[PDB]
Amino acid sequence: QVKLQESGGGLVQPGGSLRLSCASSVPIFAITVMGWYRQAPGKQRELVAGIKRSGDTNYADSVKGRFTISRDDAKNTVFLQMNSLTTEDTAVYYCNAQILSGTDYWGQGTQVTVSSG
């Protein structure tokens, strides 16, 4: 019965930054792993970053050092700060909550489009 909602995507210049938000209907401490995925139409879905209840973070190689995933317990939101964006980063970005108490839940996704203009 868990609901997830992404926000914060949109258009951004190459080299620019965005901060995605994933708000949760349940306390995020109840979520074992929260992760950010991305998928562009025609390609495979790709794990971008994850964060455990403890706070341990793992990132895809392509985003290491550019993206940062974090838990905001007070706002009950998991953020993905995305820096130094390029056209390779254009995709719909999805939030995923793992609640091992073993079930999966996803948000509707938010479009990120990196284009120089």
What CA–CA distances, in Å, run from 10 to 17, 27, 50, 89? 11, 27, 21, 12
Q: What resolution, expressed in A, was reported for this entry? A: 1.9
- How do beta strands 10-12 and 110-114 pair? parallel
- Kindly write down the DSSP assignment for every residue of 61-103, as one continuous string: GGGBTTEEEEEETTTTEEEEEE-S--GGG-EEEEEEEEE---E
Which residues, listed in sequence order, are joined to residue 98 by a DSSP beta bridge? 33, 104
Q: Which of 33, 46, 48, 44 is nearest to 80 (CA)?
A: 48
Q: Which of 33, 41, 42, 34 is nearest to 6 (CA)?
A: 34
- Thinking of the domain 4-112, which architecture would CATH place it in? Sandwich (2.60)
Angle at 71 between CA 65 and CA 74, to 5 degrees: 145
42 secondary structure, DSSP code:
T
